[PDB]
Design an enzyme around this catalytic site. Structure first.
Site, PDB file in Angstrom:
ATOM      1  N   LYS A 159       0.823  -1.204   0.000  1.00  0.00           N
ATOM      2  CA  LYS A 159       0.000   0.000   0.000  1.00  0.00           C
ATOM      3  C   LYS A 159       0.860   1.257   0.000  1.00  0.00           C
ATOM      4  CE  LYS A 159      -3.469  -2.800   0.505  1.00  0.00           C
ATOM      5  NZ  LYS A 159      -2.676  -4.021   0.814  1.00  0.00           N
ATOM      6  N   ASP A 187      -0.755  -1.067  -4.385  1.00  0.00           N
ATOM      7  CA  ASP A 187      -2.144  -0.633  -4.334  1.00  0.00           C
ATOM      8  C   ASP A 187      -2.272   0.802  -3.856  1.00  0.00           C
ATOM      9  OD1 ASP A 187      -4.922  -0.434  -4.026  1.00  0.00           O
ATOM     10  OD2 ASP A 187      -5.052  -2.519  -3.361  1.00  0.00           O
ATOM     11  N   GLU A 213      -2.333  -1.285  -8.859  1.00  0.00           N
ATOM     12  CA  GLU A 213      -3.762  -1.454  -8.628  1.00  0.00           C
ATOM     13  C   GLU A 213      -4.460  -0.173  -8.179  1.00  0.00           C
ATOM     14  OE1 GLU A 213      -5.037  -5.212  -6.966  1.00  0.00           O
ATOM     15  OE2 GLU A 213      -6.364  -4.195  -5.557  1.00  0.00           O
ATOM     16  N   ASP A 236      -9.705  -2.271  -9.078  1.00  0.00           N
ATOM     17  CA  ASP A 236     -10.268  -2.847  -7.864  1.00  0.00           C
ATOM     18  C   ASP A 236     -11.535  -2.061  -7.547  1.00  0.00           C
ATOM     19  OD1 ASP A 236     -11.068  -3.764  -5.414  1.00  0.00           O
ATOM     20  OD2 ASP A 236      -9.135  -3.614  -4.434  1.00  0.00           O
ATOM     21  N   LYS A 260     -13.444  -8.665  -5.629  1.00  0.00           N
ATOM     22  CA  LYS A 260     -13.865  -8.802  -4.242  1.00  0.00           C
ATOM     23  C   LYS A 260     -15.318  -9.254  -4.260  1.00  0.00           C
ATOM     24  CE  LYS A 260     -10.428  -5.712  -2.400  1.00  0.00           C
ATOM     25  NZ  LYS A 260     -10.100  -4.440  -1.711  1.00  0.00           N
TER      26      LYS A 260
HETATM   27 MG   LIG Z   1      -7.086  -2.994  -3.879  1.00  0.00          MG
END
Ligand SMILES: [Mg+2]
Ligand SMILES: [Mg+2]
Lengths: 361, 361
Positions: A159, A187, A213, A236, A260
């Site tokens: 991240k 991400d 991402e 995402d 997800k």
């Molecule tokens: Mg993500």
């Protein structure tokens, strides 16, 4: 021959295993009981209300609006069930998820087969778990990546904050000793503007292998960025229902998606999207916004139907929380798992943890 | 110097003036009281849960999640208030609307000016009301259009079913005697696939003057259709927040929008979108998903700031219901209205109709 007789909603507080997330989760769990007594379970647990247009209260409110219209329908007809949910309420994939997953649980139990077998058949390969490397100082991030590598993880999600200069150092350190058998994702969680994304990409030294991402918050920004970089891009937050996936292909906007379950709308929509991606050659990671053992069951069964070459790890979402909501054997061993082999989702909820239903239809 | 001290939520059943809509409304009304005692009002009333991703329960659930974070903020700083709502919950323009509108009411009262004057200044022209011609047999639709023309209406919205052959006859009849001073809209409400839209357009005889609103359900379909027709296209369902409006321009996707207050996110977002459209040369109609006198007040004040040449009528949304929630002088006269000249929104709610608050923060 088989009908939905009751839809019960439970609420469970799920403490964050990381203590406090900076910049517990309210889980919604649904039990569907058929007229013949078969019970199915599903979950939808938003990652707060800042990740995507979703929040706990919204999930339950959406269920309240849709549930009545589902009583009497055959839970085995998963696509028809989804059509019915769509007729009662547009969007709200998060609210539809728990209901869809529960129908699949019932479906598998009714024919005595694991969900993954009813989703096309299980693959013969294991499912790699992915790590979550929260933002921190470069060395701290590198150390945590090392900790996961030492645990057998072959997938890592790094991240970043959105501040290009420091983020560049973070990525450089986090990937410092990346190996040939590892897949790295950086991400941004939609935190980069095109300007900041370009500045970050231009600052990175050569040799860093990863896929980017959710670089920007909106579709327009992501397309704008796509035109100015050759880095692999994974959608995402912007990858929602199957209509959005087709839009990705129409716009040649990305190389794959982070699927997800609760953002997709359940296992049925998960299957629809899986097939769109596989037909196109897009990579697919199966994760969740957040979730306990029940949400994890849906992840594993869908992922067990994606050929290894196309899969980009799965997220053991339950690792994000400290409360166990159900028992199930996911065959976890040093960074890998596999879908159970018993009927349905292969889980048995702990009724004592769920408490009394907060709503019933 | 001025802070939000309390946010109260009221619920009101609004019977449909048309009896029953085939293929009452639950209204959410919010009152914000400052620490100094100033009260502001706003409304958000979804047109069912099938129009767009919005439903009554969802509006109130969204308010529950956001409200706490707003206590203590200056309601006059409308853009900052919206930034705060965005920080607490992504999307949910429908839930944000009532709160934003109430802040504008307070804002206007605090400086003793009508909302339209704080939105840039009122224009010197009247606001044309638009008719709603529900789907029916061709002659029935033509007769109803005639009824409205005979009442002084200069704007007409003709609804269609999605069945191209009959729809063509419906449009032909509905526009049979259209006049030089009238603006016609054919609203498909996203019911046409590209295939059906093309079939309909090819079936229409020459000479029919109208703009096509919301032809298809998704962005991809609407763009696909746009490439194959020269008819003016107006976005409604797909025109949501200001980010979507910028996307319309980036894609050269339409000629204007149907700006519905509660779909836009309130008067603040309404202003943002108004300026984007005016800068581009896009036409703008100001309407609402549905709503009583309170929601109508927001419509009139925003519309009174749009130059006549760019405005495409306004919807007297309260015509859709039979329950009056507030008193206000909108200067209605034979198909035209004007924004009130008193402070704030220029309305005084009827507390007896609102009942006791269903929620308080
Ligand atoms: Mg993500
Ligand atoms: Mg419309």
């Amino acid at each position: 021959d088989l009908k939905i007789a009751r839809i019960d909603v439970f609420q469970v507080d799920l403490p964050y295993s990381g203590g406090v997330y900076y910049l517990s989760f309210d889980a919604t769990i649904v039990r569907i009981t058929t007229d013949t007594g078969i019970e199915g379970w599903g979950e939808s647990t938003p990652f707060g209300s800042n990740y995507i247009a979703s929040h706990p209260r919204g999930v339950r409110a959406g269920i309240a609006t849709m549930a009545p219209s589902l009583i009497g329908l055959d839970p085995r007809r998963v696509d028809r069930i989804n059509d019915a949910m769509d007729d009662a309420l547009l969007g709200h994939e998060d609210a539809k998820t728990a209901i869809d997953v529960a129908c699949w649980d019932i479906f598998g139990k009714s024919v005595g087969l694991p969900v993954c077998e009813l989703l096309g058949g299980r693959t013969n390969t294991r499912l790699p778990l992915i790590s979550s490397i929260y933002v921190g100082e470069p060395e701290d991030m590198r150390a945590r990546v090392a900790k996961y590598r030492a645990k057998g993880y072959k997938g890592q999600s790094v991240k970043i904050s959105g501040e290009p200069v420091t983020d560049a150092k973070r990525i450089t350190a986090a990937l410092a000793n990346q190996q040939p058998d590892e897949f790295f994702i950086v991400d941004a969680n939609g935190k980069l503007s095109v300007e900041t994304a370009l500045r970050l990409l231009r600052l990175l030294p050569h040799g860093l292998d990863f896929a980017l991402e959710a670089p920007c918050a909106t579709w327009r920004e992501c397309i704008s960025l796509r035109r100015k970089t050759d880095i692999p891009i994974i959608y995402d937050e912007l990858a929602t229902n199957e209509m959005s996936i087709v839009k990705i292909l129409a716009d040649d906007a990305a190389e794959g998606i982070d699927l997800k379950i609760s953002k997709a709308g359940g296992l049925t929509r998960g299957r629809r999207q899986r097939d769109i991606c596989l037909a196109a050659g897009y990579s697919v990671s199966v994760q969740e916004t957040c979730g306990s053992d029940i949400a994890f069951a849906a992840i594993v069964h869908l992922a067990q139907t994606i050929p290894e070459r196309s899969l980009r790890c799965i997220l053991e979402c339950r690792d994000m929380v400290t409360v166990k909501t159900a028992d199930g054997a996911f065959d976890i061993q040093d960074g890998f798992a596999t879908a159970p082999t018993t009927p349905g989702l292969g889980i048995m909820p702990r009724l004592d943890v769920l408490g009394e239903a907060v709503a019933s239809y």
